[PDB]
Protein backbone atom coordinates (compact mmCIF):
# COMPACT_ATOMS: atom_id res chain seq x y z
CA UNK A 1 0.00 0.00 0.00
CA UNK A 2 2.93 2.46 0.48
CA UNK A 3 4.62 3.75 -2.77
CA UNK A 4 3.19 0.80 -4.76
CA UNK A 5 4.93 1.49 -8.07
CA UNK A 6 4.17 -1.23 -10.68
CA UNK A 7 5.50 -2.00 -14.18
CA UNK A 8 8.58 0.19 -14.00
CA UNK A 9 11.88 -0.70 -15.69
CA UNK A 10 14.86 -0.28 -13.33
CA UNK A 11 17.62 1.66 -15.13
CA UNK A 12 20.05 2.19 -12.19
CA UNK A 13 19.94 1.32 -8.52
CA UNK A 14 17.88 4.47 -7.83
CA UNK A 15 16.19 5.44 -11.21
CA UNK A 16 13.09 3.60 -12.60
CA UNK A 17 11.00 4.53 -15.69
CA UNK A 18 7.51 3.79 -17.04
CA UNK A 19 5.39 4.73 -20.06
CA UNK A 20 2.54 6.33 -18.10
CA UNK A 21 0.60 9.49 -17.34
CA UNK A 22 2.04 10.93 -14.08
CA UNK A 23 -1.55 11.83 -12.99
CA UNK A 24 -2.75 8.22 -13.35
CA UNK A 25 0.38 7.01 -11.54
CA UNK A 26 -0.22 9.41 -8.65
CA UNK A 27 -3.86 8.26 -8.26
CA UNK A 28 -2.84 4.57 -8.16
CA UNK A 29 0.37 4.78 -6.17
CA UNK A 30 -0.40 7.72 -3.78
CA UNK A 31 3.36 8.30 -3.47
CA UNK A 32 4.87 10.20 -0.59
CA UNK A 33 6.04 12.88 -3.11
CA UNK A 34 4.86 13.76 -6.61
CA UNK A 35 7.05 16.24 -8.53
CA UNK A 36 5.38 18.99 -10.56
CA UNK A 37 7.15 20.44 -13.59
CA UNK A 38 6.41 24.00 -12.34
CA UNK A 39 7.20 27.56 -13.46
CA UNK A 40 8.49 30.32 -11.16
CA UNK A 41 5.02 31.78 -10.38
CA UNK A 42 3.41 28.36 -9.92
CA UNK A 43 0.83 29.07 -12.65
CA UNK A 44 -0.30 25.59 -13.70
CA UNK A 45 -1.67 26.62 -17.10
CA UNK A 46 -1.03 23.53 -19.21
CA UNK A 47 1.01 20.42 -19.76
CA UNK A 48 2.07 18.32 -16.74
CA UNK A 49 1.33 21.14 -14.22
CA UNK A 50 -2.12 21.83 -15.70
CA UNK A 51 -2.92 18.08 -15.57
CA UNK A 52 -1.82 17.67 -11.92
CA UNK A 53 -3.77 20.83 -10.95
CA UNK A 54 -6.94 19.62 -12.76
CA UNK A 55 -6.72 16.29 -10.88
CA UNK A 56 -6.85 18.27 -7.59
CA UNK A 57 -9.98 20.23 -8.89
CA UNK A 58 -7.91 23.45 -8.80
CA UNK A 59 -6.98 23.14 -5.07
CA UNK A 60 -3.25 23.07 -6.07
CA UNK A 61 -3.61 26.41 -7.93
CA UNK A 62 -5.29 28.19 -4.99
CA UNK A 63 -2.64 26.88 -2.56
CA UNK A 64 0.12 27.90 -5.02
CA UNK A 65 -1.19 31.47 -5.37
CA UNK A 66 -1.24 31.83 -1.54
CA UNK A 67 2.39 30.49 -1.34
CA UNK A 68 3.54 33.04 -4.01
CA UNK A 69 1.77 35.92 -2.27
CA UNK A 70 3.66 35.34 0.97
CA UNK A 71 7.02 34.06 -0.40
CA UNK A 72 7.44 35.49 -3.88
CA UNK A 73 8.36 33.45 -7.01
CA UNK A 74 10.74 30.56 -7.15
CA UNK A 75 14.12 30.79 -8.97
CA UNK A 76 14.78 28.62 -12.07
CA UNK A 77 16.44 25.48 -10.69
CA UNK A 78 14.63 25.86 -7.35
CA UNK A 79 11.66 24.21 -5.67
CA UNK A 80 9.12 24.35 -2.87
CA UNK A 81 7.16 21.69 -0.96
CA UNK A 82 3.37 22.09 -0.83
CA UNK A 83 0.46 19.76 -0.29
CA UNK A 84 0.03 16.68 -2.47
CA UNK A 85 -3.80 16.95 -2.11
CA UNK A 86 -5.41 13.72 -3.40
CA UNK A 87 -2.31 12.82 -5.43
CA UNK A 88 0.41 12.36 -2.88
CA UNK A 89 1.40 13.36 0.69
CA UNK A 90 3.46 16.26 -0.76
CA UNK A 91 3.98 17.95 -4.09
CA UNK A 92 7.52 19.07 -4.82
CA UNK A 93 7.17 21.92 -7.31
CA UNK A 94 10.46 22.03 -9.29
CA UNK A 95 11.39 24.65 -11.86
CA UNK A 96 13.51 23.21 -14.67
CA UNK A 97 14.91 25.65 -17.28
CA UNK A 98 12.73 26.48 -20.24
CA UNK A 99 15.25 26.42 -23.06
CA UNK A 100 12.61 27.58 -25.53
CA UNK A 101 12.39 30.79 -23.44
CA UNK A 102 16.21 31.29 -23.26
CA UNK A 103 16.91 29.82 -19.81
CA UNK A 104 20.28 28.03 -19.20
CA UNK A 105 20.24 24.25 -19.67
CA UNK A 106 22.93 24.04 -16.95
CA UNK A 107 20.17 24.79 -14.39
CA UNK A 108 18.71 21.31 -15.10
CA UNK A 109 21.30 19.86 -12.71
CA UNK A 110 20.17 22.28 -9.93
CA UNK A 111 16.53 21.34 -10.71
CA UNK A 112 17.20 17.57 -10.28
CA UNK A 113 19.25 18.26 -7.12
CA UNK A 114 15.98 19.27 -5.35
CA UNK A 115 14.90 15.60 -5.62
CA UNK A 116 17.66 14.56 -3.19
CA UNK A 117 15.80 15.99 -0.17
CA UNK A 118 13.11 13.25 -0.53
CA UNK A 119 13.63 9.48 -0.16
CA UNK A 120 11.11 8.38 -2.83
CA UNK A 121 9.54 10.46 -5.67
CA UNK A 122 7.19 10.05 -8.63
CA UNK A 123 8.39 12.59 -11.24
CA UNK A 124 8.14 13.73 -14.85
CA UNK A 125 11.18 14.18 -17.13
CA UNK A 126 12.23 17.74 -16.23
CA UNK A 127 12.44 20.42 -18.97
CA UNK A 128 11.20 18.00 -21.70
CA UNK A 129 8.13 18.66 -23.94
CA UNK A 130 7.46 22.29 -24.57
CA UNK A 131 10.29 23.40 -22.17
CA UNK A 132 12.58 22.42 -25.06
CA UNK A 133 15.41 20.40 -23.44
CA UNK A 134 16.65 17.30 -25.23
CA UNK A 135 14.82 14.51 -23.33
CA UNK A 136 17.78 12.08 -23.68
CA UNK A 137 20.04 14.74 -22.05
CA UNK A 138 17.38 15.28 -19.26
CA UNK A 139 17.44 11.51 -18.45
CA UNK A 140 21.28 11.55 -18.32
CA UNK A 141 21.20 14.52 -15.90
CA UNK A 142 18.59 12.71 -13.76
CA UNK A 143 20.71 9.51 -13.58
CA UNK A 144 23.88 11.45 -12.75
CA UNK A 145 22.32 13.78 -10.21
CA UNK A 146 19.53 12.07 -8.30
CA UNK A 147 20.72 9.78 -5.44
CA UNK A 148 17.35 9.09 -3.82
CA UNK A 149 14.77 6.76 -5.42
CA UNK A 150 13.03 8.27 -8.40
CA UNK A 151 10.22 6.77 -10.51
CA UNK A 152 9.92 8.62 -13.83
CA UNK A 153 6.59 8.57 -15.64
CA UNK A 154 6.87 9.53 -19.30
CA UNK A 155 3.48 9.75 -21.08
CA UNK A 156 4.58 8.82 -24.60
CA UNK A 157 5.53 5.29 -25.68
CA UNK A 158 7.68 6.59 -28.61
CA UNK A 159 9.77 8.75 -26.26
CA UNK A 160 9.88 6.02 -23.58
CA UNK A 161 11.32 3.59 -26.13
CA UNK A 162 13.94 6.13 -27.34
CA UNK A 163 14.97 6.93 -23.73
CA UNK A 164 15.39 3.21 -22.75
CA UNK A 165 17.35 2.42 -25.97
CA UNK A 166 19.52 5.57 -25.28
CA UNK A 167 20.26 4.42 -21.67
CA UNK A 168 21.05 0.80 -22.67
CA UNK A 169 23.57 1.77 -25.42
C1 LIG B 1 7.68 14.66 -22.83
C2 LIG B 1 6.19 14.52 -22.50
C3 LIG B 1 5.65 13.18 -23.02
C4 LIG B 1 5.92 14.68 -20.99
N1 LIG B 1 4.49 14.56 -20.72
C5 LIG B 1 3.94 13.94 -19.64
N2 LIG B 1 4.71 13.11 -18.87
C6 LIG B 1 4.09 12.48 -17.86
N3 LIG B 1 2.80 12.52 -17.51
C7 LIG B 1 2.08 13.34 -18.27
N4 LIG B 1 0.74 13.60 -18.14
C8 LIG B 1 0.36 14.49 -19.13
C9 LIG B 1 -1.04 14.94 -19.25
C10 LIG B 1 -2.18 14.35 -18.67
N5 LIG B 1 -3.28 14.97 -19.08
N6 LIG B 1 -2.86 15.95 -19.90
C11 LIG B 1 -1.53 15.98 -20.02
C12 LIG B 1 1.46 14.82 -19.89
C13 LIG B 1 2.57 14.10 -19.34
C14 LIG B 1 6.47 15.97 -20.40
C15 LIG B 1 7.52 15.99 -19.49
C16 LIG B 1 7.98 17.18 -18.95
C17 LIG B 1 7.42 18.41 -19.28
C18 LIG B 1 6.35 18.38 -20.20
C19 LIG B 1 5.90 17.20 -20.77
S1 LIG B 1 5.47 19.85 -20.59
O1 LIG B 1 5.33 19.95 -22.02
O2 LIG B 1 4.25 19.81 -19.83
C20 LIG B 1 6.48 21.15 -20.00
C21 LIG B 1 7.01 20.81 -18.61
C22 LIG B 1 8.02 19.67 -18.71
Swiss-Prot record:
Q: Where is the Macro domain?
A: 2-169
Report the activity regulation comment: Inhibited in vitro by GRL-0617.
Q: Where does the protein end up?
A: Host endoplasmic reticulum membrane
Q: Which reactions is this enzyme annotated as catalysing?
A: Thiol-dependent hydrolysis of ester, thioester, amide, peptide and isopeptide bonds formed by the C-terminal Gly of ubiquitin (a 76-residue protein attached to proteins as an intracellular targeting signal)
Recorded topology in the membrane = Multi-pass membrane protein
> What does this protein's UniProt record list under function?
Responsible for the cleavages located at the N-terminus of the replicase polyprotein. Participates together with nsp4 in the assembly of virally-induced cytoplasmic double-membrane vesicles necessary for viral replication. Antagonizes innate immune induction of type I interferon by blocking the phosphorylation, dimerization and subsequent nuclear translocation of host IRF3. Also prevents host NF-kappa-B signaling. In addition, PL-PRO possesses a deubiquitinating/deISGylating activity and processes both 'Lys-48'- and 'Lys-63'-linked polyubiquitin chains from cellular substrates.
According to the record's subunit comment, the protein's assembly and interactions are:
May form homohexamers. Interacts with N protein.
Kindly provide the name given to this protein in its UniProt entry. Papain-like protease nsp3
Protein's organism = Severe acute respiratory syndrome coronavirus 2
Q: Which residues of the full protein are shown?
A: 1024 to 1192 of 7096
Amino acid sequence: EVNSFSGYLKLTDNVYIKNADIVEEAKKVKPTVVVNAANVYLKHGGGVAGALNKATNNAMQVESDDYIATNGPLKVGGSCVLSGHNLAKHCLHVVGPNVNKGEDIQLLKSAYENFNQHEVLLAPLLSAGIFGADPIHSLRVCVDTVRTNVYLAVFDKNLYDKLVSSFLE
